[PDB]
Amino acid sequence: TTYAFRVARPEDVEAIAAIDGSFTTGTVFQVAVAPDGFTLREVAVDPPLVKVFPEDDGSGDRRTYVAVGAGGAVAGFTAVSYTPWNGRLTIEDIEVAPGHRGRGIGRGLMERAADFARERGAGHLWLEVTNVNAPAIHAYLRLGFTFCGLDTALYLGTESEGEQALYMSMPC
Amino acid sequence: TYAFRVARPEDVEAIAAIDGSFTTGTVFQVAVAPDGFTLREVAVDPPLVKVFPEDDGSGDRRTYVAVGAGGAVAGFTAVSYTPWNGRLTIEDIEVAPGHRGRGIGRGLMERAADFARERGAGHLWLEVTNVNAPAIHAYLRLGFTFCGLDTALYLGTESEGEQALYMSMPC
Ligand SMILES: NCCC[C@H](N)CC(=O)N[C@@H]1[C@H](O)[C@@H](OC(N)=O)[C@@H](CO)O[C@H]1NC1=N[C@@H]2C(=O)NC[C@@H](O)[C@H]2N1
Ligand SMILES: NCCC[C@H](N)CC(=O)N[C@@H]1[C@H](O)[C@@H](OC(N)=O)[C@@H](CO)O[C@H]1NC1=N[C@@H]2C(=O)NC[C@@H](O)[C@H]2N1
């Protein structure tokens, strides 16, 4: 019980904001576009890519969960979003604080997302991940997500141009 | 044979009747691997009948209309601009059942392209179900290529079993 999980309250919103999800990676997922399909291959990059997410990301059925340590600091969060149309719970964000990884916070937050999904009658969880976010992709694969598609054009004209939006899902 | 203009309130009821329901002897089959996605056009026998659902789950917006002699709508396109990624979404483009093979598709998409360059768009983008081979062939003809897909988009919908394919082209 190193970490407790609960619905986020107003005092958590400011702590959530500071966990921006910025990462370093020695690998990226390269997207190869053919006329008849798309291939993902993990490739080493030297020196390591430093990715800071932009301040402008282009943005009852909503919910934010938070992982809290003994001193009351937010160690992680997930913001989820339900669309009844296709029974999709979108994992809009999931982050673990830099110094709190390898302690089952990721799994715990996703388990709370899954609880909300079954509460709303969702058929699948779904998330967007940039092809350069190899650490997150490995984390999502570990938690049972698989690639369900991509949009190689989504980040065109954005601060993230050169990257591809990869889509992952899992049933519940 | 056909003139193009911005759609007016009296066109809304005619636009509604043009749902784009089709028959096809082929579909684009989606193969999911752990490391990617493959699209292969495959014959289906007997022909697939696709009726689009009434519930589709839905300055920078614009609707164009193709008009014949006698002033009847022969087709339309609704487009949508997002400055964030300079994307003009072709939200819908349909030609009336009896008016195909007359360059209405091309004409409507040319009006979409004019709006894109007017707004400074970097690319056009559309969604098409994998079973809509006729539309996919039309879009390929007009210069669109596949830029991705979402095999999970239609889960829990009337269209479950189909995959949402994404196509784009630069301006
Ligand atoms: N920020 C922490 C991570 C947040 C989550 N993982 C969600 C995510 O992936 N957001 C990414 C990320 O903010 C960043 O992408 C890169 N590569 O940095 C920017 C591009 O600059 O695009 C975002 N994507 C978007 N898709 C949405 C869309 O289609 N319509 C509406 C609008 O919401 C769109 N924004
Ligand atoms: N009439 C011709 C179609 C013209 C266009 N290309 C529009 C299109 O493709 N609509 C399809 C089509 O209505 C149908 O799909 C099948 N397979 O029939 C249903 C599945 O029931 O899903 C629609 N898609 C959607 N995507 C959107 C989304 O992501 N969020 C919000 C909302 O807008 C969503 N709706």
Numbering used by the authors:
A (entry chain A): 7 to 65, 73 to 185
B (entry chain B): 8 to 65, 73 to 185
Reproduce passages from the article.
Here, we report a noncanonical FAD-dependent enzyme Orf1 that adds a glycine-derived N-formimidoyl group to glycinothricin to form the antibiotic BD-12. X-ray crystallography was used to investigate this complex enzymatic process, which showed Orf1 has two substrate-binding sites that sit 13.5 Å apart unlike canonical FAD-dependent oxidoreductases. One site could accommodate glycine and the other glycinothricin or glycylthricin. The resultant product is no longer sensitive to aminoglycoside-modifying enzymes, a strategy that antibiotic-producing species employ to counter drug resistance in competing species.
Almost all ST BGCs encode a ST-resistant N-acetyl transferase (NAT), a self-resistance enzyme, that acts on STs. Given the sttE gene encoded in the Streptomyces lavendulae BCRC12163, the gene product was expressed and subjected to probe its drug resistance scope. We then determined the structures of SttE in complex with ST-F or glycylthricin with CoA, of which crystals were packed in space group P1 and P212121 and determined at resolutions of 2.42 and 2.36 Å, respectively. The structure of SttE revealed a single core domain of a general control non-derepressible 5 (GCN5)-related N-acetyltransferase (GNAT) architecture, which is composed of seven extended β-strands and three α-helices. Both the extended strand β7 and β-hairpin between αA and β2 establish the substantial protein interface promoting protein dimerization, where D164 specifically interacts with R101 and W139 via electrostatic interactions. In the microbial susceptibility assay, the E. coli test strain that harbored a sttE-containing plasmid displayed a diminished inhibition zone, in which glycylthricin or ST-F was added, indicating that SttE is a ST-modifying enzyme and the N-fomimidylation or N-iminoglycination is antagonistic towards the acetylation of SttE. D106 appears to be the base deprotonating the β-amine group for the acetylation modification to take place, while it is a bit far away from the terminal amine group of 4. Its nucleophilicity, nonetheless, may well be enhanced by two mainchain oxo groups (E105 and E141), thus accounting for the equivalent activity of SttE towards 4 and 7.
